[PDB]
Paper text:
The alkaline α-galactosidase AtAkαGal3 from Arabidopsis thaliana catalyzes the hydrolysis of α-d-galactose from galacto-oligosaccharides under alkaline conditions. Here, thin-layer chromatography is used to demonstrate that AtAkαGal3 exhibits a dual function and is capable of synthesizing stachyose using raffinose, instead of galactinol, as the galactose donor. The structure of AtAkαGal3 comprises three domains: an N-terminal domain with 13 antiparallel β-strands, a catalytic domain with an (α/β)8-barrel fold and a C-terminal domain composed of β-sheets that form two Greek-key motifs. A sequence comparison of AtAkαGal3 with acidic α-galactosidases further confirmed that Asp383 and Asp447 are presumably critical residues that serve as the nucleophile and the catalytic acid/base, respectively.
Residue numbers in the entry: 5 to 102, 120 to 253, 263 to 749
Amino acid sequence: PAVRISDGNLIIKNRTILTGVPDNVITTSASEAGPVEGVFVGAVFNKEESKHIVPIGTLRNSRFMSCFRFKLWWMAQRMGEMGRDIPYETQFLLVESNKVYTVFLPLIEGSFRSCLQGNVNDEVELCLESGDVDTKRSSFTHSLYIHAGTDPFQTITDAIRTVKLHLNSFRQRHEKKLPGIVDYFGWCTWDAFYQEVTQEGVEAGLKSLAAGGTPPKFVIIDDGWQSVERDAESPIFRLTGIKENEKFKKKDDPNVGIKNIVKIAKEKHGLRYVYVWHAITGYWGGVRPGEEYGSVMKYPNMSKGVVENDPTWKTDVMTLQGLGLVSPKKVYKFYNELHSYLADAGVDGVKVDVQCVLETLGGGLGGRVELTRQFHQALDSSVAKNFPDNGCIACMSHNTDALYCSKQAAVIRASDDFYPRDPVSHTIHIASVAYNSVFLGEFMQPDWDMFHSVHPAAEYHASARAISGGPLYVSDSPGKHNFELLRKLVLPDGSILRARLPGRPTRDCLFADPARDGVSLLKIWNMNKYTGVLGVYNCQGAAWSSTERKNIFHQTKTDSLTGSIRGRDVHSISEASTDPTTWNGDCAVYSQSRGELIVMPYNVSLPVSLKIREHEIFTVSPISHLVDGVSFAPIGLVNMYNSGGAIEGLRYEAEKMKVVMEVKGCGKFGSYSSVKPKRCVVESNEIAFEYDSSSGLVTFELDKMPIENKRFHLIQVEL
Ligand SMILES: OC[C@H]1O[C@@H](O)[C@H](O)[C@@H](O)[C@H]1O
């Protein structure tokens, strides 16, 4: 049976993972298409309760990685060996048997949501909550799912799909429509102006970016454009109407609102998309109590796991001053009127924020899962009507309540905010995004957030954004730009080189905490179509503290650390080979910063050494062997972080000793060749190239962007 409770012990492929499983902890593997290859888990209790907790079993000497909510809104990573180290509010837990990998997915079930928490006795406990006193239950069959396999990433995905086949209440990332913004550079006003943003600031930020040759094709007008008011210390603000405030009304004709800056953005400055920010509850303090939308004051319910990890939530302005919560009966009316107004003004999407609050406001109304479902149901209906390119970015949304009802939305902020003025944040941001994407990336495309192009950590953030697989945008104040940096990310038409997957830790890094263990470098892998990409980060020296309950610096024993890369760290690198059945695993590896090309045989390590807050990017291309002595691998646009993303087509013709490629973009193009090319041809005309006989690096300039909708350079390399 493979995954079974036998005696009081949890056994997986004949390894004990857990011991001492209570007698009340019930399994089942039946489903519509019966044979389930892992197991659903639940529990019978005595009484009708709105909160429950049962140990699943006792976990010892088994490496894990967990993603846990350090705050209501956001997750971060924790590794350990013992059940006691599992944090409160653990929403995703992956266990290594030493070869074999087990995932534990705490689920929503009816009106209940579960998570994992460790206790002092090393038991893994299942915490079950409705977030509502009037919604109570004694027995559950499907509040956890457990599945195991020998590829950690494939194990995760296979489990998620099985959970999806049970619930039918979400879709996986790859089944959703990505809105078009993800293929372009954007800018977001948040760090530029905070809430003091005006339409004149919008226009200035778009002009300053385009002026330097890296034009954003989307903008996020963030928090600060809505009509909000304090109740009639620090007071909370509530939405007073759905239309823009006076900073977004054309100064000349007060009856023309946000339409003005949209039309300026698009017509005058060439933007393809405009998005705006709003809280899932309208604003931070919700909507002002009123008839129109049924808004009535609600006060956040505290839950233990949340409060345990974030004690400041007890005294937070939202918690103490409440929110005007729009009624479930009128929630669709609210989103629709807001979004209809926005869409009729030419807005293409919304960054929907403060999302987890709903788990704390289910008191009257069905509890946490139900309130979440209802709001998202309405939100998704309005989005599909009003923003039909699927214009929704989910923010502050890292709860299982939301994730398991993520049926439509396709982009999710993967971490806590970029914080330009907080030195502790930068290493942590890189770690959180990477680890969180392991799980969040099964649901939606991770968004690794805005960043500053002018900042000590700019390269560190930007390089990470390049290999993220997600939208790429800055929050630069106007005129504070590093265009040399930006050209590494953004082509002259505003298109980017997006990788195809959520960027994730290598197999290598899944169980070794690169923020805390003091020994390991973080390696992040992604794919393009015909290359892999690998980013290496030192992100030691900071993390959330289990004692201080916040992000701090902590002690590190060296500044510099040495790890290594292998072609195969790029987990799916074989999908980039034009001939995987004959491919012997050899890769061309190009160091983006050092500008160095190395041939790396299958399994040969190359050492990499980095001080804290340093990084390196490598493009990893499968070598094709045309004949004995004629070997080749494309690299792409070598002065861009994700160089391989420029290669759209690749074909080998060994009978003619020829390589045929389709390449997007412009700038310097690089390839590995064992021999000096006879000819390099671009659009039928021979072009000059250089060749470094000792590295095999071939180079030539793709001078301009492809000529008119003819999307690609056609390149022939004759060897
Ligand atoms: O107050 C506005 C801000 O809200 C945060 O939750 C969000 O992550 C930021 O990116 C910005 O939108």
